[PDB]
């Protein structure tokens, strides 16, 4: 393993940062194989790196258009000479907005193979990272009865207004 | 690759919710390897099978006590025939409740490799699957100043006494 081995899986993280950006879904598929699997936080599967580039332009023109990624490596480990793992710390800026919004915040891990055509990234899981304290208001909503969480969405309704 | 191969894979899914179950961190920890990266759903890391198992047994004995898993497989693919990627369902039901918290809902990525010693799972990113109705709620409610959060979480505490 070298240290270009090393530069080339995380640019990879920068690569994708840049694409969401400048809302690029081709960019943003680009380290990614043919074979890949990415899933989403909500448990969409994508198939590869033309899928992923399908999805995320579609995505980037509508429903996160004006957002903003930010992002830096956790770790890197080389399995072996051909494997690697990469967790990623990822933060949403969502339009209008200067600020990230946790619930946005993401840890994704990034599968890295080192195949006939160099490195690639054959799988993805890009899931939401909770705070215990954001996991406990949640146990807390969940242990609620239907009509007692229906007072609770409809205050935050009535507070957004407002 | 054959059959023994992906059944050996699917088999950890099994092993890991019956030892979650019996409340037992070494059965848990069993099918990793000694270098696996195992990440929370709050972004712990722990580094190798002991402890994958001292961490595990710590929270079977105490902050997840009396818990139950459930689980099942979403997909298993072969990058290779020494590299898997397993993706499973699992939730969760609290103490004293016959039912799964939606709090708990989550989606783990296992990479799994073949080795010297056979397969042993080698990274796994066990985060919470959010549905798109949890993840604009919690984006309207990160949106709220931090009075208006108050109100609601206040509301919450008020609702569970009661
Ligand atoms: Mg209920
Ligand atoms: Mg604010």
Known sequence: TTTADESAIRAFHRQMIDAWNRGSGEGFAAPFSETADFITFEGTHLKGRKEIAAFHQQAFDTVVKGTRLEG???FV???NSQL???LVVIR???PGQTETSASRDSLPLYVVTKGDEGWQIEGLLNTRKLTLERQF???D???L???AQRQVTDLVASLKQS
């Open 145 to 147: 009865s239907a009509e």
């Open 141 to 143: 909503f969940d242990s």
């Open 77 to 79: 480990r080389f399995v």
């Open 92 to 94: 949403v800026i969502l």
């Open 137 to 139: 208001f949640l146990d």
């Open 84 to 86: 690697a793992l990469m």
């Open 72 to 74: 830096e490596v956790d």
